[PDB]
Ligand binder design. Structure first.
Ligand SMILES: CCCCCCCCCCCCCCCCCC(=O)OC[C@H](COP(=O)([O-])OCC(O)COP(=O)([O-])OC[C@@H](COC(=O)CCCCCCCCCCCCCCCCC)OC(=O)CCCCCCCCCCCCCCCCC)OC(=O)CCCCCCCCCCCCCCCCC
Ligand SMILES: CCCCCCCCCCCCCCCCCC(=O)OC[C@H](COP(=O)(O)OCCN)OC(=O)CCCCCCCCCCCCCCCCC
Ligand SMILES: CCCCCCCCCCCCCCCCCC(=O)OC[C@H](COP(=O)(O)OCCN)OC(=O)CCCCCCCCCCCCCCCCC
Ligand SMILES: CCCCCCCCCCCC(=O)OC[C@H](COP(=O)(O)OCC[N+](C)(C)C)OC(=O)CCCCCCCCCCC
Ligand SMILES: CCCCCCCCCCCC(=O)OC[C@H](COP(=O)(O)OCC[N+](C)(C)C)OC(=O)CCCCCCCCCCC
Ligand SMILES: CCCCCCCCCCCC(=O)OC[C@H](COP(=O)(O)OCC[N+](C)(C)C)OC(=O)CCCCCCCCCCC
Ligand SMILES: CCCCCCCCCCCC(=O)OC[C@H](COP(=O)(O)OCC[N+](C)(C)C)OC(=O)CCCCCCCCCCC
Lengths: 80, 155, 183, 149, 117, 506, 119, 105, 78, 137, 49
């Protein structure tokens, strides 16, 4: 089903909706790592997952900062 | 009755029809909660709580924080159910049939008399074995603090 | 540590439903080629009470049972079956002794452990009586390796961390020994 | 001049904590003790005439992995997860009732049903490409292909 | 929503009791011991009294902070928001990070690093 | 030395008063830090000892003579870039003061050099993801360093989204590898190089292919390069390829152990498609930076053929090409930052809006450079002639060496297409030379006083007044003669590349 | 006007736009599709952007407010949070005491004054 | 060399032994090639996923189907609900079948 | 200089006083934080004057005697 | 550790949510019973905003934005201190020195955002004063 | 915290003394279940020569 690229129908029509899809996409990677690590009883996989959660947070903050300044750049008359 | 399927079908229904950014942020929260709950049971209770503390408590309320800043402005029932049903049919992520139909166990042993939580071992290795990974992370965090201020600060 | 595993009982029945756990029995006993042993029947609290007396009495066999595991080089379960029965018989010997020499001193102590979260710090009054009894009637002593004799924790006259609630049977039995024995 | 009318709500809030705590301490202790008396309901309820004073078992906290192995080991001996027994020899049923749980190792439901989380370059190859599975199936086939020698 | 604000008040008052005032621990171990010696540990009446006592100690400690929630409301004027965000960042946070580098130092100096017994 | 000095620059910059002179002086502190880094690096690191390959930091980082070559190259090219922001590129205060309006510019650049230099050394999938983010995050910040600009911020937003998807593909490949083997160290994975799905390493490459702008992903790179300020485009269009192409070469070195043909066909499908778009794309373009964006894609296509072939001659072809292409790229962009002084000024039709971010934006703004400055026009001509591949410049030896590696491994189809694609691309390199000179003789005697350079004040009218600053002129001349006169020392340089080893040994 | 509204650099003269396959006017009828052929930069200070005159966030600090200890309609015009302009709309308690005093003797007009400042 | 496959208690986990025996063979100096270590590589993958052993379970399930062997008499007894691990099932002498307490330990 | 801002490399003592009066939120957060690493450096002083470090825990599995298996071990046999 | 007692609590709280909503819907008197003037829907006067009585119709400070944005880096610093808490003893001095270094690098960020005064709202638009200067001829 | 260190040490040695006893019964169970698996496989696949 997803070979027809169904996930494109599931992503909204705003720049903020793309940002969320990136997080939900990466969330799948971390859940996959936690799954393998627990079955193998391997904590190295859990170190990887902890890094992925922390790195996925820094990516969100930078992306939102760019989006925020993108928004105020239009609303930059400020001649009052 | 693995009810975790029904939560995502509702979630998969509203992802196809969301229009504004209020519903788009709702899909985020509606996805972490099944992720947290399916981690609390089964696999890892430690990373279910780390996700709540780090995703919901830190990165999710930032989205709604900037949505109030950005703006708030501005299909057919047959095709949706047809798509969702088609999406519903084939849900086998892997094609190793024996790996998905045959169950396994582990044998416990008493050789580990120093029993401590996973977060004890993760800290044991992150602060000793992979102290470079930990130190680069604080370096990536440092760049963000500088990176946020240069992007956003006006003067 | 309450991590989920695939090897024992998990936290909740919702874990079992997700994993589709089957609790499988195996009726088959051991083959006759392996001579039988009488398994230890003590529960958690009696074992933690008599743990240091099993260590004092079965020290040679426990070390030898482990040294068989070290030198079996991965075939430990199969190549140490005979040395693993001496340990089971030795430990059964100690619990049978405590039942026939110090039955009330032993029971008082592990009733205290079952009353105080299975912690040694909460049951020193009952534990001191049991150690004193065992010494005179079986010569076993409790020793914690790696420290001087004067600095063992269970001999600490004024411990920093003490039980919040007292065990009535321990306090009553203690003061009786303050008359029976401290003449 | 202490106002007693002002402190009436506090004496009721004090009773609120005591009500919840008094029930939890006694009910959980009684249930744990009763199930640690024997392996059937006609033993748990009744108290024998020749039985001595009852020794209650307090609830256990701050456990580890050994307490999950100790709990099942106690279950196979007495029928309770916190049973009491100090017999030097176990019953002959102890050698034929070891519980070994068998469970599946399939990926989470969200990982394989979410409209977005399941889409990925490698997750499609696991789901729609036979390249990996045909290679591994060779090793399974060659297990039974080597029993002749 | 109003109930939630007061569940949090009860909770955060109980949490201050747990983290700094010993939780359910008694104010006096002697008074705790003397009171419980009037009951037999072989009867369920002992455990009701202990549970009432142990929750009583927590309740008294928790009540003092639910009192202080109200007490500070009756004594302090409301704090301006712009000066409120700068308080936690420019005053509280440096102190809180200063201690988190201070407590491990004192514990290590005297060989007192904690372990879960 | 890099990391320690970065903290001092971070703190010091946040103390002193916001001014252009202090901002420009701090940029000259970073130029020292990068120079100091090179002296310490070359002192301890030697080709003769790093030949075996040495594990560092609990095997997370592995360094050998092939990686070590690029670290020194990256440091060198980062010196030539910092010379732009640290000195005058024109000397006219209006145009130049843009480089000094940002105090965190040099800090972010120093952040990236740490990111760039560590990426080729990675030896763990856990640190591969961390380092690739450290480099990726630094580029987005540098793209948005001029936060007032509408196009710059729009580009960083486009860059962040594409890179985020690119990083997710990279992260997902590593997770899949960990799922199969449970091992994180790359050396431990090599023990199971025959037992794992080799296409999961290809999914890793598909993520690194996005970050170098390879077709079909080329669309965003062309858009990004044609919107950022020319000083920014000069950095983000070259540096990522220096450190990622080195990483791609190593990953392909491990991949060719099992010599899977299906992996090579897909990559050949992307290399073949990219040459087509890299050649036919630039035929119909008006913006110079869009032209150099299509030019960049074509050269990356050539450099992948050396990577894909991956033999003993592929090390020589890649090591030589990556060096000469960097110097050519610096030389061309440095000239475009200078010749903006010869632009005319109105005293009309087509309403072309120019900004201080890209004063030179269209190819026909290079008109009559043969008249306004003949010496620098030839330098741009020599640089473009190298890109065309006219011998005996540096560019010819890059294509000649790449062809040897390509044909020696049987890539006949790709070798012929690259020689077709090179000739097709010569059309739009020739247009730059057509605009530079072809209308010389009609304009030879013209009354020109409306140039931007004619708004410079007259100092004394007795002393000689040079038109171009000192440092930028010396860099342009040095790199133009190195491009032109490589034939003199070519034999020594190539024999200096035979020694760069990647586990060849014996 | 009422509903909407619309250099630091040298005015640069660019003439003769040409590509490798021809000149601009030869492809100017197709360049509306090629977005790299847009001669209109979006960062030029002369870029015409027809932006509506959205009014500043105007809060009505209306009478039903504890702060308004009478009947006040305070109109606050602010940029962000810092207040630009404020327009107090008094008169919600205008009872025409001055008109009513003229119809009453001096002794009857006295109680009208206790009702000016209530306190 | 870096630690891989660390258990949830800081020690080697189930499959660390197999992985270590692989490293000993690959980094050994008396080997001309990597052929002798090929079996050890399979064991490490086998220890983690049991793919070959799960396959063997599939044939024994399928072979009994084609012979008519009753699953309940060839398989092993099991219990799905943990509350019904009663003393009758555990085999205790005077055990009831009343459910066991799995509420709070 | 009745109220001038002190220069740190000429007036070290007065420079801290300026910050201990005008920025109490910075001076004492640094003063508290530095008291941790300072106390770590005085650990060797405590070893020679107060008490030695404790014996390390037995957290490495079962203590295996460093010898060969006993050969005359009898008793508890089948 | 068993958590079947915890599960029943979460289930009961989930049931308690449905009860709170519906108890209002079953105890309020019927709209006809009180005044019949309409339901909440048609009575748009009652179903509207509160603007203190008079009917009327977010460009927030950048300082507020940087407060929220800088929350995320400082949160990941705090959450990554969690592994050190439950392993402070077994990492010894080595893990303690690493932890302090992990904090120093982040503090250099705290210095940077303290010197720029990024969180200050500032007043660039207003609060201006001037000197009246006569311009005699 | 120095008292907890010794209380910890006392508990680890208490667990070390019980480890051989509790592992000797765990080795037997693993052997018993291993023999039962191979008995069942031989029973099912006895008709295959
Ligand atoms: C506390 C123990 C005090 C005490 O036991 O004796 C007084 C207290 C009665 O106070 P009282 O009868 O008003 O004192 C006689 C005069 O009326 C007292 O009249 P007065 O106004 O002259 O009292 C003067 C005295 C205040 O009166 C007091 O003595 C209270 C001082 C206690 C302070 C701490 C509490 O001094 C002050 O006003 C200043 C005290 C406040 C300073 C700050 C608080 C210190 C902390 O005796 C009792 O304990 C019984 C009543 C207490 C409530 C019990 C029932 C609670 C409600 C349950 C449901 C029924
Ligand atoms: C304890 C229960 C808490 C949730 C109560 C609400 C339940 C209603 C169902 C929504 C939640 C289902 C999860 C999928 C998100 C769907 C969000 C959505 O599409 O909009 C729902 C809501 C109502 O709007 P609707 O008419 O349904 O859609 C067209 C409106 N233009 O549009 C709105 O935004 C109105 C306000 C709803 C805000 C809900 C915030 C998101 C949900 C977070 C809380 C629940 C977390 C998810 C738990 C279930 C996960 C499957
Ligand atoms: C300025 C150029 C400085 C050149 C410094 C190059 C260098 O010192 O290292 C050369 C390096 C060989 O080093 P290696 O083989 O590892 O062993 C010897 C180390 N002691 O050889 C290498 O492999 C380095 C590869 C990169 C070489 C790039 C070529 C240099 C280009 C010269 C640019 C000149 C620009 C004009 C400067 C104007 C200054 C105002
Ligand atoms: C404010 C209350 C602080 C308090 O009660 O402490 C003040 C001091 C110290 O006592 P502490 O160490 O806190 O008491 C804790 C120990 N118990 C369990 C015995 C209570 O009390 C006095 O000695 C008076
Ligand atoms: C102790 C004590 O007095 O406990 C008796 C209790 C509650 O005491 P209280 O005075 O309401 O505690 C509140 C203490 N404040 C004032 C700090 C909030 O009331 C009864 O059980 C009757
Ligand atoms: C030894 C103990 C004493 C040391 C105290 C000295 C204070 C230094 C000082 O105040 O340094 C002065 C400088 C510059 O101050 P300014 O306001 O920019 O300029 C001064 C005012 N003028 C313009 C009128 C001249 O401040 C800084 O570096 C600011 C960053 C300090 C770090 C804040 C966080 C600390 C966190 C601690 C761990 C969580
Ligand atoms: C818990 C709260 C305890 C005190 C409040 C109880 C009052 C509610 C009783 C009630 O609603 O009784 C009146 C009702 C119906 O009459 P109505 O006026 O239309 O009901 C209004 C509420 N409806 C319309 C939603 C049902 O009669 C019964 O259904 C009788 C059974």
């Amino acid at each position: 089903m997803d070979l027809i690229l169904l996930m494109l129908v599931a992503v909204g029509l705003n720049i903020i909706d793309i940002y969320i899809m990136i997080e939900i996409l990466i969330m799948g990677c971390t859940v996959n790592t936690i799954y393998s690590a627990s079955l193998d009883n391997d904590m190295i996989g859990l170190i990887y997952s902890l890094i992925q959660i922390i790195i996925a947070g820094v990516e969100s903050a930078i992306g939102l900062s760019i989006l925020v300044n993108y928004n105020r750049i239009r609303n930059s008359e400020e001649i009052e | 009755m693995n009810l975790e399927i029904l939560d995502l079908s509702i979630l998969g229904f509203y992802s196809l029809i969301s229009s504004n950014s209020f519903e788009s942020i709702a899909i985020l929260v509606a996805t972490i909660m099944p992720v947290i709950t399916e981690l609390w049971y089964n696999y890892s209770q430690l990373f279910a709580l780390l996700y709540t503390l780090i995703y919901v408590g830190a990165v999710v309320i930032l989205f709604v924080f900037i949505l109030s800043v950005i703006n708030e402005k501005e299909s057919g029932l047959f095709i949706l159910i047809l798509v969702l049903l088609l999406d519903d049919l084939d849900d086998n992520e892997s094609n190793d049939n024996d790996y998905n139909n045959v169950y396994i166990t582990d044998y416990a042993d008493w050789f580990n008399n120093y029993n401590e939580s996973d977060l004890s071992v993760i800290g044991n290795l992150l602060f000793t074995e992979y102290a470079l990974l930990l130190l680069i992370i604080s370096f990536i965090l440092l760049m963000s603090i500088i990176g946020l201020i240069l992007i956003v600060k006006k003067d | 540590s309450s991590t989920h595993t695939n090897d024992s009982l998990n936290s909740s029945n919702y874990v079992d439903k997700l994993k589709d756990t089957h609790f499988v029995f195996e009726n088959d006993k051991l083959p006759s080629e392996i001579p039988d042993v009488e398994e230890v029947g003590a529960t958690t609290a009696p074992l933690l009470s008599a743990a240091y007396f099993i260590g004092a009495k079965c020290q040679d066999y426990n070390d030898d049972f482990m040294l068989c595991q070290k030198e079996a080089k991965g075939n430990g379960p199969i190549d140490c079956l005979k040395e693993g029965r001496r340990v089971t018989r030795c430990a059964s010997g100690v619990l049978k002794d405590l039942n026939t020499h110090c039955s009330d001193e032993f029971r008082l102590h592990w009733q205290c452990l079952s009353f105080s979260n299975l912690e040694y710090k909460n049951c020193r009054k009952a534990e001191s009586l049991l150690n004193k009894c065992v010494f005179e009637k079986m010569n076993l002593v409790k020793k914690i390796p790696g420290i001087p004799e004067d600095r063992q924790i269970h001999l600490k006259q004024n411990p920093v961390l003490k039980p919040v609630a007292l065990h009535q049977d321990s306090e009553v039995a203690f003061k009786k020994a303050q008359n029976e024995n401290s003449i | 001049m202490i106002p007693f009318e002002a402190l009436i709500p506090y004496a009721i809030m004090f009773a609120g904590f005591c009500l919840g705590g008094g029930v939890m301490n006694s009910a959980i202790t009684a249930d744990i003790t009763k199930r640690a008396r024997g392996p059937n309901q006609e033993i748990k309820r009744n108290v024998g005439e020749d039985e001595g004073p009852r020794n209650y078992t307090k609830p256990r906290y701050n456990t580890d992995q050994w307490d999950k192995y100790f709990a099942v080991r106690d279950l196979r001996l007495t029928g309770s997860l916190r049973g009491q027994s100090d017999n030097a020899v176990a019953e002959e049923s102890f050698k034929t009732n070891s519980i070994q749980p068998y469970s599946n190792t399939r990926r989470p439901w969200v990982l394989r049903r979410h409209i977005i989380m399941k889409n990925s370059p490698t997750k499609w190859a696991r789901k729609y490409s036979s390249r990996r599975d045909e290679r591994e199936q060779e090793i399974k086939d060659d297990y039974i292909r080597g029993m002749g020698e | 929503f109003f109930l939630s604000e007061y569940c949090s008040m009860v909770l955060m008052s109980t949490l201050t009791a747990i983290f700094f005032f010993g939780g359910y621990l008694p104010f006096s171990n002697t008074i705790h011991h003397l009171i419980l010696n009037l009951f037999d540990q072989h009867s369920i009446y002992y455990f009701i009294i202990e549970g009432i006592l142990l929750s009583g100690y927590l309740a008294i400690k928790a009540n003092f902070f639910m009192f202080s929630f109200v007490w500070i409301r009756a004594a302090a004027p409301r704090l301006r928001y712009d000066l409120l965000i700068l308080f936690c960042w420019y005053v509280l946070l440096p102190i809180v990070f200063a201690i988190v580098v201070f407590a491990p130092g004192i514990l290590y100096c005297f060989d007192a690093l904690p372990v879960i017994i | 030395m890099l990391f320690t000095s970065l903290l001092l620059i971070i703190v010091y910059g946040s103390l002193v008063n916001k001014s252009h002179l202090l901002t420009k002086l701090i940029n000259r502190l970073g130029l020292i830090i990068i120079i100091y880094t090179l002296l310490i690096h070359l002192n301890i690191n030697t080709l003769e000892n790093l030949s075996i390959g040495i594990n560092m930091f609990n095997n997370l980082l592995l360094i050998n003579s092939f990686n070590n070559t690029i670290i020194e190259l990256i440091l060198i090219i980062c010196i030539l870039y910092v010379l732009l922001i640290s000195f005058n590129i024109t000397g006219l205060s209006i145009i130049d003061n843009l480089n000094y309006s940002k105090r965190t510019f040099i800090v972010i650049v120093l952040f990236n050099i740490i990111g760039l230099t560590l990426l080729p050394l990675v030896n763990d999938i856990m640190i591969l993801f961390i380092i690739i983010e450290l480099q990726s995050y630094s580029l987005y910040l540098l793209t948005a360093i001029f936060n007032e600009s509408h196009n710059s911020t729009k580009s960083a937003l486009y860059y962040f989204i594409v890179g985020s998807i690119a990083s997710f593909i990279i992260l997902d490949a590593t997770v899949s590898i960990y799922d199969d083997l449970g091992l994180t160290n790359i050396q431990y994975i090599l023990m199971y190089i025959d037992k794992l799905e080799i296409f999961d390493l290809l999914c890793l490459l598909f993520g690194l292919f996005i970050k170098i702008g390879l077709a079909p992903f080329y669309s965003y790179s062309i858009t990004i390069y044609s919107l950022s300020p020319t000083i920014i485009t000069n950095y983000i269009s070259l540096m990522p390829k220096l450190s990622i192409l080195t990483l791609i070469y190593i990953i392909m070195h491990y991949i060719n152990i099992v010599n899977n043909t299906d992996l090579n066909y897909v990559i050949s499908f992307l290399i073949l498609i990219s040459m087509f778009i890299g050649s036919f794309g630039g035929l119909n373009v008006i913006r110079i930076k869009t032209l150099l964006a299509y030019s960049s894609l074509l050269n990356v296509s050539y450099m992948l053929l050396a990577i894909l072939s991956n033999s003993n001659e592929s090390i020589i072809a890649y090591i030589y090409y990556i060096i000469q292409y960097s110097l050519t790229h610096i030389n061309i962009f440095s000239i475009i930052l200078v010749i903006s002084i010869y632009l005319p000024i109105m005293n009309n039709m087509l309403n072309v809006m120019i900004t201080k971010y890209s004063p030179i934006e269209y190819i026909n703004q290079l008109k009559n450079l043969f008249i306004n400055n003949i010496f620098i026009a030839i330098a741009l001509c020599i640089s473009i002639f190298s890109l065309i591949g006219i011998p005996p410049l540096t560019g010819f030896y890059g294509k000649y060496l790449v062809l040897i590696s390509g044909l020696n491994n049987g890539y006949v189809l790709l070798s012929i297409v690259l020689i077709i694609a090179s000739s097709i691309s010569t059309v739009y390199y020739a247009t730059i030379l057509k605009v530079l000179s072809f209308d010389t003789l009609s304009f030879k005697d013209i009354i020109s006083n409306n140039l931007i350079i004619n708004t410079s004040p007259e100092n004394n009218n007795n002393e000689i007044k040079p038109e171009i600053s000192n440092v930028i002129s010396y860099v342009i001349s040095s790199l133009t003669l190195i491009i032109l006169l490589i034939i003199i020392q070519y034999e020594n340089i190539v024999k200096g590349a035979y020694l760069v080893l990647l586990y060849n040994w014996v | 006007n009422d509903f909407y509204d619309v250099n630091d650099f040298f005015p640069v003269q660019v003439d003769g736009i040409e590509s490798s396959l021809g000149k601009y006017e030869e492809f100017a009828k197709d360049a509306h599709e090629w977005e790299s052929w847009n001669l209109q930069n979006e960062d030029h200070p002369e870029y015409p952007v027809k932006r509506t005159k959205i009014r500043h966030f105007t809060l009505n600090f209306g009478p039903q407010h504890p702060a308004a200890h009478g009947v006040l309609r305070l109109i606050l015009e602010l940029h962000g949070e810092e207040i630009l302009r404020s327009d107090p709309h008094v008169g919600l308690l205008h009872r025409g005491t001055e008109k009513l005093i003229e119809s009453k003797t001096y002794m009857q007009a006295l109680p009208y004054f206790d009702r000016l400042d209530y306190v | 060399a870096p630690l891989q496959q660390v258990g949830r208690h800081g020690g080697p986990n189930k499959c660390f032994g197999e992985f270590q025996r692989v490293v000993e063979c690959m980094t050994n100096a008396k080997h001309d090639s990597y052929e002798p270590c090929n079996n050890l590589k399979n064991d490490y993958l086998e220890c983690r996923k049991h793919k070959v052993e799960r396959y063997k379970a599939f044939l024994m399930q399928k072979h009994a189907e084609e012979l008519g062997k009753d699953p309940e008499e060839i398989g092993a007894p099991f219990v799905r609900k943990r509350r019904f691990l009663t003393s009758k099932t555990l085999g205790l002498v005077d055990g009831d079948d009343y459910e066991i307490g799995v509420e709070k330990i | 200089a009745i109220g001038d801002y002190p220069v740190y490399y000429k007036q070290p003592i007065r420079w801290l006083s300026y910050h201990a009066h005008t920025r109490p939120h910075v001076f004492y957060a640094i003063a508290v934080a530095a008291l941790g690493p300072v106390f770590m450096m005085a650990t060797p002083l405590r070893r020679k004057f107060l008490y030695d470090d404790h014996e390390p825990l037995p957290a490495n599995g079962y203590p295996l005697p460093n010898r060969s298996r006993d050969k005359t071990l009898t008793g508890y046999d089948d | 550790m068993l958590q079947d007692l915890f599960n029943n609590y979460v289930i009961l709280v989930g049931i308690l949510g449905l009860i709170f909503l519906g108890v209002n819907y079953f105890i309020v008197e019927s709209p006809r019973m009180d005044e019949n003037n309409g339901n909440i829907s048609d009575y748009i006067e009652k179903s509207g905003p509160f603007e203190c009585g008079f009917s009327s119709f977010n460009p927030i400070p950048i300082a507020f934005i940087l407060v929220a944005l800088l929350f995320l880096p400082f949160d990941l610093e705090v959450s990554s201190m969690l592994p050190y808490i439950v392993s402070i003893y077994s990492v010894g001095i080595y893990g303690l020195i690493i932890f302090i270094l992990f904090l120093l690098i982040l503090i250099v960020g705290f210095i940077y955002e303290f010197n720029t005064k990024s969180l200050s709202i500032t007043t660039i638009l207003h609060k201006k004063n001037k000197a009246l200067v006569k311009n005699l001829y | 915290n120095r008292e907890k260190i010794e209380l910890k040490r006392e508990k680890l040695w208490a667990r070390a003394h019980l480890m051989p006893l509790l592992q000797a019964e765990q080795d037997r169970n693993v052997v018993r279940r291993t023999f039962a698996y191979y008995k069942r496989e031989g029973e099912i696949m006895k008709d295959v020569p």
